[PDB]
Amino acid sequence: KPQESQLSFTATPGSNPNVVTLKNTSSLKGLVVTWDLGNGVTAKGEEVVASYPFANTYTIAMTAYNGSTTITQTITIANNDESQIEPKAIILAGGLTGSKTWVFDRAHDGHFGVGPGAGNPDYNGTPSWWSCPAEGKAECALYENEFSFHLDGGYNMTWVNKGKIYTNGAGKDKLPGVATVPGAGDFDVEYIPKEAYTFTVDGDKLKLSDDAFFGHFAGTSTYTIKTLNENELYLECSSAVESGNGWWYRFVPKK
């Protein structure tokens, strides 16, 4: 078996420093070397390239075979690479650094609503059963739920509330927390968010990790992005607890 002393490699950042060339420099000749690039990718070859969209420290492992022996180094990637990051994620986060908090558009009509959902034969693309007037859900927990997006190591999201989410009878029946009836009707349900979440954006699909939802519980973590720009995030979702019911939500930046 190779001796940890016999083995070496270089990790050289390119003109794009998020793309790193890994080269076997070991004191023994014609070993077979495999790599763990620290980013979920493994490779085999004397010289391979690794790409890291996100600023972080990463552990690279080279394994030489004659037996097998493994050595590691850490690399620091200094800055997020916009060329390898989902563009809509950067709008959600307000940029490649920092964070951006989004809140219900409570001051304008139509920031929450319900209608035939996209699989329903009556779908018309709008919350045609009920559309919330400005401040219509002031008297419940709905507007206390705020969502922060940030690209600190990955597609990260922070969910803050004051310990409650808003839902209806169908939703309350799927959640363990105590339910209360607030001034706006339906149900507040005790629900404490996890300290950290992730998200994915694939085309117009926004998915939240760990069964998260945008303050209003309808049994799904999948949203359809209808509008996303620096001033507005307009979402549809399809209820998993009331077949064929669709919900609409409009978020704007926290001021």
Ligand X SMILES: OC[C@H]1O[C@@H](O[C@H]2[C@H](O)[C@@H](O)[C@H](O[C@@H]3[C@@H](O)[C@H](O)O[C@H](CO)[C@H]3O)O[C@@H]2CO)[C@H](O)[C@@H](O)[C@@H]1O
- CB 242 to ligand X: min, Å: 6
Nearer residue to ligand X within complex by CB, 168 or 238: 168
Question: Token pair for residue 4?
Answer: 């940890």
Residue carrying structure tokens 């919330």: 132
Among 161, 168, 221, 238, the residue binding ligand X under the rule CB under 6 A is 168
Per rule CB under 6 A, count of chain residues that contact ligand X: 8
**End-to-end Cα separation, the chain, in angstroms:** 61
DSSP state letter for 6? G
Residue 188 in the binding site for ligand X (CB under 6 A): no
Nearer residue to ligand X within complex by CB, 114 or 206: 114
Nearer residue to ligand X within complex by CB, 65 or 130: 130
CB 221 within 8 A of CB 200: no
The H or E element that residue 116 is part of is strand 112-116
3-class SS of residue 249: strand
Residue 186 in the binding site for ligand X (CB under 6 A): yes
- CB 103 to ligand X: min, Å: 18
Q: Of residues 109-138, which lie at the interface with ligand X (CB under 6 A)?
A: 114, 129-130
Nearer residue to ligand X within complex by CB, 65 or 129: 129
Residue 43, class by beta-carbon neighbours within 10 Å (0-12 exposed, 13-18 middle, 19+ buried)? middle
Residue 148 in the binding site for ligand X (CB under 6 A): no
- At CB < 8 A and 24+ separation, what contacts does 55-59 make? 55/79, 55/80, 55/153, 56/153
Nearer residue to ligand X within complex by CB, 63 or 245: 245
Among 63, 80, 145, 245, the residue binding ligand X under the rule CB under 6 A is 245
In the complex, residue closest to ligand X by CB: 130
Nearest-angstrom CA–CA distance, 199 and 212:
10
Interacting residue ranges for ligand X, rule: CB under 6 A: 114, 129-130, 168, 185-186, 242, 245
